[PDB]
Amino acid sequence: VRYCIPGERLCNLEEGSPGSGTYTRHGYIFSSLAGCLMKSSENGALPVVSVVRETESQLLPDVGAIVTCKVSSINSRFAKVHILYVGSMPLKNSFRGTIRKEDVRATEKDKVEIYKSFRPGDIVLAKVISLGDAQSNYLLTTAENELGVVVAHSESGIQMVPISWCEMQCPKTHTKEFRKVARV
């Protein structure tokens, strides 16, 4: 196996096609990273050559991506969050987000009271939809059956458990509270 530097001759446009993290010019394929030389043969020949470091310390979000978050504060019409994980991998820093009162459920419906959906301190799984404005920057959504709060936390510091699609209950004091439970 061989590694890369962010420029070198790799292949012709006839001997393969550019993949992820690469660029081409003057009929040649040029590297743009310092990762590893991967040639996805796939099926149909002409492998899509690409270079991947495979050790992602940081990664910029996209138009569509799954992210693990952490609520900071909640408002009657939005809920500021902090992006913590990009899908699976840990993130070295923390970005910001905002869930408007249209992205909670998968119907973009009326009602949907924000107060009992995303209580602060929880950890949720959500998907971005846009690159946002300067007020709200990433505009995340949870309009799916698989998205919502996944690992909640009790009033007094006890791991919480899902109890229904909308209700969760404390194991110690048997107290009933409202969340937006995502499928496991």
């Binding site: 059956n145 458990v161 899902p162 109890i163 229904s164 699609w165 209950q169 194991p171 439970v181 499928r183 496991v184």
Partner: peptide, 8 residues
């Protein structure tokens, strides 16, 4: 403990 998950 109640039912442990809620299996949807």
């Amino acid at each position: 403990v109640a039912i442990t998950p809620f299996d949807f």
